[PDB]
Amino acid sequence: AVPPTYADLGKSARDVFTKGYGFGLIKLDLKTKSENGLEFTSSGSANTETTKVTGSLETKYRWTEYGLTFTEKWNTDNTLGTEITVEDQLARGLKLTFDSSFSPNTGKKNAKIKTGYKREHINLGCDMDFDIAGPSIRGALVLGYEGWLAGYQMNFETAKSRVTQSNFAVGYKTDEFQLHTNVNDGTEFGGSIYQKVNKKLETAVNLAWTAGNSNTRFGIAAKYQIDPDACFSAKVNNSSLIGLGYTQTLKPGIKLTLSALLDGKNVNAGGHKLGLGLEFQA
Amino acid sequence: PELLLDSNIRLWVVLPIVIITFFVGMIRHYVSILLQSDKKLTQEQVSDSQVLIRSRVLRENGKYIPKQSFLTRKYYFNNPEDGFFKKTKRKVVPPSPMTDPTMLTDMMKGNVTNVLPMILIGGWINMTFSGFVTTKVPFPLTLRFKPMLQQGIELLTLDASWVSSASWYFLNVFGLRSIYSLILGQDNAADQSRMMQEQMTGAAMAMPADTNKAFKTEWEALELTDHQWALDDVEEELMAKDLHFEGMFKKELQTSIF
């Protein structure tokens, strides 16, 4: 039941590739849960290469009285964003999302409507983007029976012409084996496999192929937790890229993560990309 | 005094904005009352609440009580053989607050992010009137507030005293903050600033998050408290005068029987 959506389809492998290391960036997040319903998150990203300071304050209002969720975010470039989520209002698996962005300093507005239908094995989703440049409509439908799953994504724009962007993603998802192949307009061909040998060993393999210039690139990643608080991550790319990350829980909420990407050669040309991450949860 | 303004811009901006914010606040208060829903209360939790109230009342009012009965109460509560609080144990939920994290959370939560909805209203109001001059504030202001104050007028020589409609409505929001309670009462929920923030007396005062831990805490609090019979001092009234019973006895004649 509840088949995976298009964005979530394969998100395990990308998340393994994404989460774990943030070299070149400084991670600083604080999450706070209140007693009744209040959620507060303050995250701060610091860059040493570009010397940039980025951050967002995110306030979450979980209302189970009617299924309403109120989210308000604030960035550093004077951008204001509000979001309303309604789930299980009158239908079975209907979800309505309203996202709005407005700037007080200058004047700029953007709108986004998300709609989601979830059923026994049928997943429907429609995103309508309202902007001055041009409205766009994007629909993703996922169908599967037991383990065989296939999803279709389409993107259409009324501003220019009959532009249509096709996406066909076919995969096999089960308890410990997860394989997924994504096809973009018969041009992009991606294949991700992810498996778990034990409760401590995780392996992932990614392949990318194209029909235009016949470019092929593959990469493998391993994740292993020595202890419930100590974890290690390694990733190797096709050409020479190697990345190592190590995470350890220091205080019962405080965790420290270290990331290092090495690009070195033997012709006197080498480079290090380091990154520190630290978060607090309350 | 300069910049002679029209008499049509005061009757089409000031009064509309004032009535708009007044009725927005009133509507918010009424909708907050309407949306309020009761919380289900289970009998065991109710009984736990009443026992807590009984023990707290014993703690507060324990001087005007016989020592023997006070010790009987305290033994019944403590009772090392059986114990009411010791034996009676309900389900326990795994907690998550921690000393340093919660000590910090006391300030992290706060009410910092409760101004944005009013900023949205101000932004819409300012969007409606692009180039406008509502009023001037007598209070002298610094030129570094002019970008926030004017926000739509291309003038660098003009003073910052002349405000736009955005700051006009912003000051209008807190101007009636103490006026709303005048017509409603002490418990007013018409605050335009705190829209999402729930402000109420609070349904179901008693919140036994961990029944067992509260039981143990009250068990030790009742063991700590001493006994001092405040009745034992009766000699103060002994040597005194009785003139108040002469007091309204004079004023109890004047009323007849209906």
């Binding site: 509000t82 309604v86 009158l90 309203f98 709005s100 962005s101 709108a111 409507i113 | 949205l120 819409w124």
Partner: peptide
């Protein structure tokens, strides 16, 4: 608009009631 979209949800919810 940030305000026009926050009214469309109540509008739809109130429309779905008589229907």
């Amino acid at each position: 608009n940030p305000m026009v979209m926050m009214m469309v949800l109540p509008l739809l919810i109130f429309v779905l009631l008589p229907k």
